[model samples]
Target: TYRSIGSTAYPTIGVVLLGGIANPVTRTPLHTSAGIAYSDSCGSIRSETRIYADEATHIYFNGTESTDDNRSVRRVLDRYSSVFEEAFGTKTVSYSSQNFGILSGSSDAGAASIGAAILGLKPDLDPHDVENDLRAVSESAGRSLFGGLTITWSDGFHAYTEKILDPEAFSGYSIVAFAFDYQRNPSDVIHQNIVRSDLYPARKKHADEHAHMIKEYAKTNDIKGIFDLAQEDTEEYHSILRGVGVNVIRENMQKLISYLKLIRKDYWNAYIVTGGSNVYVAVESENADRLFSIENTFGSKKKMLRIVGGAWHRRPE
Candidate 1:
């Protein structure tokens, strides 16, 4: 019989590393910042599905435009041609308008139309102005220039990308620490396979134990106080709780607490601890919160804890 023992039912928590800061002299972690914005959620999951569906339909039609009726070909072509003439000096990049008509027959009619339109624009304008105009048009249209993909700006306008997967797309969402339950229904087959029931429990226990071991190991390596943000084996796990406003942080924390209460039956008892890093610990419960908070004087500026576990396993020995 397969007996699930120890913290097997617990979720594995992992850290997603973000931005870097370089010191002019020592080049160390003076203040490093990494964050998972709402946009990252869309791109990582939802947008991918949309792209796959679009591609599948394209392939099923033998690489041809599925329907000329629904095609925005003419509208796109006219707008693009006008934009091209305004931006560049040439209105005829293709051999002829007939050549563009052939392109409109392909599966990627939208892209071809936009390309043809840009080709018709002035070619001598400043590249940055041209880019700005493109961005303005895209934003005004509420869709990306290339198809209808959603766009997200990260770091600044300097680093723009797509936010494909949106959490709101899923119903009844909650934030939990160290839990992998949410990932059970991932759209990707490979992710689902790796996070199977038979393997998760053992993995979680190992991760928790490793976190403690790492803390102790840090002591020996001359590392001072270390924060432990370990938890259950689930996809929607939070390694760190972060937000710009205090209200936002509180709202997110309340959601996390609600989820923990629902899953508390799986463990003995759980404790939400506020300390060097605010952490919620789920074990056979006692006054774990009081215990951790007694020494929790070092208030952190950032309201997030870097959880370590799962694919992010770390240990000294």
Candidate 2:
């Protein structure tokens, strides 16, 4: 059984609101905590977190948005990224996040104090340019900064990782991945399904109406947290966040699904528990069941991956 200060533990997986801030159709901090718990194949859940408050304070959520900083979900994920990197034995492990999860660089200082190097980024900023700047700032921080990108918008299911042809840019960086979704259309199948008619239309509408707000807020100098309701707006904060999950997150995720078909699920199966939904263990038909099991984890979603007989990063191409 997983434990929490003010959370109900779930079966094979669960999340405790370790405390931060949240939405109210306005700008206020919910002071909620975000942590994950995973069950052994035996089904006993064990929750753990490496994102402590002291550490979280130093890592600004979105460097491109504002200079003022506060603890945000990105802080949680940075540490999570670090944990996985070490676990995977220093291989390339990419993942994305809408909002701030992609701002990862395991350093006491990154892109300069309170997200400075992320400056001058436009929605269409060239990815390689973004990387060059990152390389300049952190050199991937003495920590292998792979490709954690802080995107323009954070709504929708935009998840996926691109193979770096010149990982040389991220040589010292534990450069793995990034996360952000767009209403933009693409030819990929799973990509199309997630952004089908309604999804795209909805994203277009929201971006038309709300993208300006985040943009406007980005112009504000002292804005502290992304979802900090202290002064942002009096709108449904949680709803906005949920919107990011549905819209900006889908595409990149499909990229994962497409590549996931290559994962050799029989080895040390990998699990990515985003908000505690992509976590479970049943004798279900490996791929199908596992994917669905994590998708709506009451708030969870699932995908799959693994290496055959050795480390995927070490395997001969």
Candidate 3:
């Protein structure tokens, strides 16, 4: 049986908390990013893949055939099919995924899951080595692959992941997610247009300094410190995205932020956006129930997620 399954919680909204974006110059991110894996009442995002001895490949999303889903998932599989072949022999592959929650960075999770499955099927591969390979597919994939309070950084030539904290590190914290139902600009388009803005250089410098401070605090495993810093980082990144003429934050999301500030104020520790639109609020575990009581205060689709760690693998009997 050449079948394996990999699963990971989608990252809570802090998509790229440290580095702005990987510039084309080095093909690596200049700084580091930190985010938590999450699972809401809906469940985790999972990828089930099977390789046939034949030499073909196909992918599906939810239950739909998406041989041409056309994003990071397809990109990762296309680039690494040979690696899969190495482990399972020359084979055709059938891959499918299920995303049950308001998952942030689905593509990152997708890429990570693919790498996780490969690791499971092979079992002897070094996780750090696999992380490096995952980064080659997507700069943020390592964060999803490593889970917990993970960080993604580059060694100038290659990007890799280091877990700053395990899932238990954030056991006292919880997340409230609100998804915006509106058309938004794709991340690649944002990356392309962000560099053209006059504010790009200033943001990059600010990000570098901010990232240094974050790294120092992260060394202490201080979750609050990281959360506050992440909020600032998210604001700066989105401000740069707006400078380039792509306003992914919709009016309702803006109102939601304002409402939270007006009602809960500092009751919530921090908030981060997903794919530029959805918002995830971080709070003390004790305050989670209090926070969710107001879920309908805003008219967005919402889910309550617990902060978690990286991808997992399984082989069905």
Candidate 4:
């Protein structure tokens, strides 16, 4: 079960009361008792009870429209507030009355100040955790609000992980795999370029050293069978390989098949998980296929490649 506190825990509560500030919508931002609250229930609430507070400010940029032109600023604040509210319950004070003083300088600085003010009222909330969650939510929202974000709430703690990939892999006598790194990373960017590079011949001198070492190691270790599984499109695969060259996919596939054919003499099978593209498993024979398809669906275009005694099967066209 999940637990909640603060304005998030209760829809009736508001932010103004939490921060001990005068109602901005009614009274001014200053008063003799400005920063202190005189609540009778202060010591009665549980210490572990969750709480979240949110404050937003409007700032003006020179030559820009009204101070509220950009909804992003408010939207981000609202999002954080909502998360807090959802996690905590309800705010004890009203948000409309909790407005901080307006600033005309840097909007970024103004946003930060408002965020700090809101957080200062809720000293019990962990700052690091809030920042981490906010970063993750912003990154996830970059793709789409609904596409791949997974949100889970349990035992008063909210946790989420994003499923950002739509993978597709194809197989035949030789397999072509493509996978996407939905979440962009620097290493993935480097690999995507390496795959499309035309300077391979020049790069092969140093590259071959590692290749030869890998082959030698396999030979010495008597390693026979291996498999590479991936999705079917270039973008997804290249995205998956960020720092790894695109040719690495084909190269690794060839090496694995060659090793299996040379040493194990057709003793291995490879199956790519293409759940993103709706493709499932492939086996080396009809019996193997039947065995694998016992609880699975067979798609059209199952192709087979004969290797030694076993056959390598793929979707038939």
Candidate 5:
């Protein structure tokens, strides 16, 4: 019997500076991903899973069975089942897991937590190997696997993720998300549309360059430069997506960004980033409180989160 818990933050921005398709089924991005983390209060999770030495492998998400999380969990386990068999001498297993936050955007965290739990089962498994396996399924899972500011990139053949900035670097910053009443488009559909866009080739090249610049900025600990580059990359990616009729920013979100931009130059050091219908504003901790007042005027609901580091085990209380 094995029991372990894992915690990881969902990314503030997905795909980071990279785009385009790759191999191993959903192995997207040819260049880089500026993987950032969310504070535990928002789109992050501390999850627990218990694997039993049973005859058949059974998985559950938050105590229930659903297609959304179940299939993803299965995919993560399937990747290393042979390895588990070799190590534990039992390919058959059953595990029940729980996610602390909403299950919607926590797929990466879900995979990450399971990856962490697998480590507890067999302490000898290389974390990089687990991260690689997770990356093969979820491109951004590496971000959740390692946490903090990570970069997920490929060398035209192999893909990998590494942490560049520790959580301490982001200590002075905080994030607030304005959640609109909308759901994100399916990843499959989004990817299909992205590749068809004429801007795909140019965007891919530009992102690859930006990826290199980001690494240089990280090396120098130029936090502002890193944020600026990621913000620029995110906008460019969305611009191309918009051109293809795939819009994640709706009218409400557009209004929110417009308003934030107006006061950002004078009122605060706020940076805007979006994923799906949510508008995330990253600001200095000093101005973090002001965002709540600002959110009150808007129709969207607000969520508060802080910058955090990598995943870890949660021992039972």
Candidate 6:
């Protein structure tokens, strides 16, 4: 996480050592701005954030962006212990996770294509413009989970380093609190393996050779589509992985399945989350705990966090 703060105007923010909802603390009710034209179900987007926030309600200190972030987040909430208890209550207050989804990977022809198809894009739709609209259309397209979409791009994961992973990509999509790009994109070692997945048909200069290599490789392998290859522990699914990258398809999307287990929301619903390396936990509240005590490969913790952003939906209110 960037120790430095953001550059947006006014830029009012705070850090909590540890805190929550339930009985200890409580709050809400906000307002602000936007633009035209989004005048429909697929609405326009804005932070509506204030520069000098008397209190940081829409706060971002969950720490799930990274292991360290989580710990610091605890400290953050702790630091604000007085604030929460005062505004809301005391130890009686607890908290629960919110609706969210982990959009793993960054901008690529693959994500672009899938996003396009999912959002019903036109063949002639400007590739550049489509990314910005992907989430808005998907809002009403309504497969499930449209509240918060935390995206992990292939780039460094932060605003400064990466590209494709743009919060501005969608009207409502919000950038992760901290730029966690470094953790999200595959490591060089992993990238090496991913690159090797397709050991053939690399040379594209010669049309005949390229066709022959793929045709030959395609023949030798019992594979029909890239999906088949990706099933292997580390096999190549370049076509698909290349679209969003290998992390999402890790050994049959192992991480996603495992991550979803941590989610507290109903399985039938959408909003599963994706995180860096092995993060973006999907969970809800626990019986006694407010932040929700959950278990998974990462071990028991208050709750897992993702770099999430809001998405707008167009339809009947």
lDDT of 1 by residue, 196-251 (tens): 33443444444344444433534443111121222231111222212111121233
Residue range with the least summed lDDT across 10 consecutive positions in model 5: 1-10
Better of 1 and 5 by lDDT: 5
TM-score of candidate 6 versus the correct structure, residues matched by position: 0.23
lDDT of prediction 5 = 0.65
- What lDDT, from 0 to 1, does candidate 6 have? 0.23
User: Estimated TM-score per prediction?
Assistant: 0.19, 0.21, 0.84, 0.21, 0.86, 0.23
Runs of candidate 4 with Cα error greater than 4 angstroms are 1-80, 90-187, 190-254, 260-268, 271-317
lDDT of 2 by residue, 1-317 (tens): 11111111111111111111112111121121111111123322211112122222233232232334323334423433433333333322222111212121122123221122111111243433433333232222111212211112222222111221121221221101222233322212222243333434443444324434433444442122212221122122223434434232343454553344344254112222222112222121334333433332332233221100100011111
For residues 1-317, write the lDDT of model 5, one tens digit per residue: 23233333344344264445575464645555666766544434454455545576677667985546455556767776765675456677666767675423465666666677677556688887787666544556777778788777765467777887887888777777777787787655566677778888777677767767877887877776776666677688889888888888778777887787788777554444444566777777788888766744357877776666665655421
Q: Residue 270 in model 4: shift from native, Å?
A: 2.7
Model 3 worst lDDT window (10 residues): 45-54
- For model 3, how does the per-residue alpha-carbon lDDT over 1-317 read when each residue is reduced to its tens digit? 45444444354344345334565332365555566777754454433333234345666776777745345455555555776677555545567666554456765676677777777766787877766555544557776777776666553466666776787877888887777777777766776787787876676566556656766776777777777777777777878777778787788988888887775555756878755567888888999888877855456776778766677676632
TM-score of 5: 0.86
- Candidate 2: worst-modelled 10 consecutive residues by lDDT: 307-316
What are the root-mean-square deviations of the candidates from the true structure over C-alphas?
Answer: 21.8, 20.8, 3.3, 25.0, 3.2, 19.4
Residue pair clashes in candidate 5 = none
Candidate 3 residue 136 C-alpha distance from true site, Å: 5.6
lDDT winner between candidates 3 and 4: 3
lDDT of the structure predicted as candidate 1: 0.25
Clashing residue pair totals per candidate (backbone < 3 A)? 38, 68, 3, 42, 0, 38
